[PDB]
Structures are given as structure tokens and as C-alpha cells.
From Swiss-Prot, chains A, B:
Main location: cytoplasm
Enzyme Commission numbers on file: 5.2.1.8
A Pfam family this chain is assigned to: FKBP_C
Enzyme class: isomerase
Record GO terms (molecular function): activin binding; calcium channel inhibitor activity; FK506 binding; peptidyl-prolyl cis-trans isomerase activity; protein homodimerization activity; SMAD binding; transmembrane transporter binding
Listed GO CC annotations: cytoplasm; cytoplasmic side of membrane; cytosol; extracellular exosome; membrane; ryanodine receptor complex; sarcoplasmic reticulum; sarcoplasmic reticulum membrane
Location(s), subcellular: Cytoplasm, Cytosol; Sarcoplasmic reticulum membrane
Reaction(s) this enzyme catalyzes, per UniProt: [protein]-peptidylproline (omega=180) = [protein]-peptidylproline (omega=0)
Modified residues (N6-acetyllysine): K52
Subunit relationships: Interacts with TGFBR1; prevents TGFBR1 phosphorylation by TGFBR2 and stabilizes it in the inactive conformation. Interacts with ACVR1B and SMAD7. Identified in a complex composed of RYR1, PDE4D, PKA, FKBP1A and protein phosphatase 1 (PP1). Interacts directly with RYR2 and RYR3. Interacts with GLMN; rapamycin and FK506 abolish the interaction with GLMN in a dose dependent manner. Interacts directly with RYR1.
Keywords for the protein's UniProt record, in alphabetical order: Acetylation, Cytoplasm, Isomerase, Membrane, Rotamase, Sarcoplasmic reticulum
Source taxonomy: Eukaryota, Metazoa, Chordata, Craniata, Vertebrata
Descriptive protein name: Peptidyl-prolyl cis-trans isomerase FKBP1A
Length: 107, 107
């Protein structure tokens, strides 16, 4: 699945709707803590229309449970992220993935 | 599977061994011709140790059938590349992928 632990409460009231642009700052790491991508690094918020499948299902499904402002810890299982093939050279096969994700705003 | 059509014969005699560094210039496109990554663009040959799983199985298995110098057309089926999840925002699900690949040298 994806599972969501909170690290920061967000306004507790605004939650993403299908079609909205989620603006986020994330860090991605391997189940062993090993980091693999971060928008933080790049100093660039990342943005994706919710609903459009342009981000992994664990993100579609977990960021939709977050209120504006929230910082949360997402654990995503392979079936909800990159499956059995993985993404060679970045994500190995059947990797459970931990994302540290912060919802900055909706458009 | 991967399937390999030739576009240029290579020396016909040197074939990659496990452990060797393959240096390649490729272009990747979607089964509809739509381009999605190219080392050519970047003017940078790409290099990967054969055998190490750091490139998709269709490449492990198809570039190993190429002699130094050869330019070949690789069609790779989802199971041999990015499976059913794909790589959201780049490769959609169950995509058959066409690579235009040229083997420049071995290290």
C-alpha cells in the first residue's frame, strides 16, 4: 500500500482534489535510508496534477490524504511504486520506498 | 523479449562479455515513435557494465548480441524493460519500447 505517518500537521482542512496541482518538496530514499532523489537538493518544488497518473500510485494515493502545509512520511510498497522491474540504476526490484513529502500548496 | 534488427554491421567479430563496459549512443522512443531519452541529444556516450543489471534487461540481452561498431534497432517488451507500472511521467504502463542503439566500444 502507501502508509502515511505525519511529521507536521498541515492546516488539517484543505485536502487535495482530483485535477489540482500539488506543489511538493520531497526526498526519496530506499528502504535502507539511502537517498535517491530530492527536490530539496535542487531547491525546486516539484508539481504534478493529482489524478493524472504522472506520479507513482503511492504518491497519488498518499499525497491526496495530506492537508496543505503537512509534512508526512510515506512508505510505498513496490506494487504501489516501481514494481518488480524497478528502475535500473536507480531503484532496484521490489523495493519498498520511503518518501519524506511536504505539501506546500495546491493549484 | 528484446528483438534486434541491424541498421549497421559492426565488426562482426567483437561481441560483449559480462563485466565489460559497453559505451553506447542511443535514442529511446515509445512504440509510437515518440522519443523519450537520447544520449545523442546530450552529446554524451552512455556507459554501463554489461552483467551488472544497471540497464534494462532488454538492453542487457540485446546489446550483448551486437558487435563493436554496430548500430541496431531494439524492440523491448514491457516485461523486458519497465513492466506494468512503467515509469510515470516518462514511460506509461505496458509500453513496448524501441531503442536505436549504437555500440561504440568496449571497456
Amino acid at each position: 500500500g502507501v502508509q502515511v505517518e505525519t511529521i507536521s500537521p498541515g492546516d488539517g482542512r484543505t485536502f487535495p482534489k482530483r485535477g489540482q496541482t500539488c506543489v511538493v518538496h520531497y526526498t526519496g530514499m530506499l528502504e535502507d535510508g539511502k537517498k535517491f532523489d530530492s527536490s530539496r537538493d535542487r531547491n525546486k518544488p516539484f508539481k504534478f496534477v493529482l489524478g493524472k497518473q504522472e506520479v507513482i500510485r503511492g504518491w497519488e494515493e498518499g499525497v491526496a490524504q495530506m492537508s496543505v502545509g503537512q509534512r508526512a512520511k510515506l512508505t510505498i510498497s513496490p506494487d504501489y511504486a516501481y514494481g518488480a522491474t524497478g528502475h535500473p540504476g536507480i531503484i532496484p526490484p521490489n523495493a519498498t520506498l520511503i518518501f519524506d513529502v511536504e505539501l506546500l500548496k495546491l493549484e
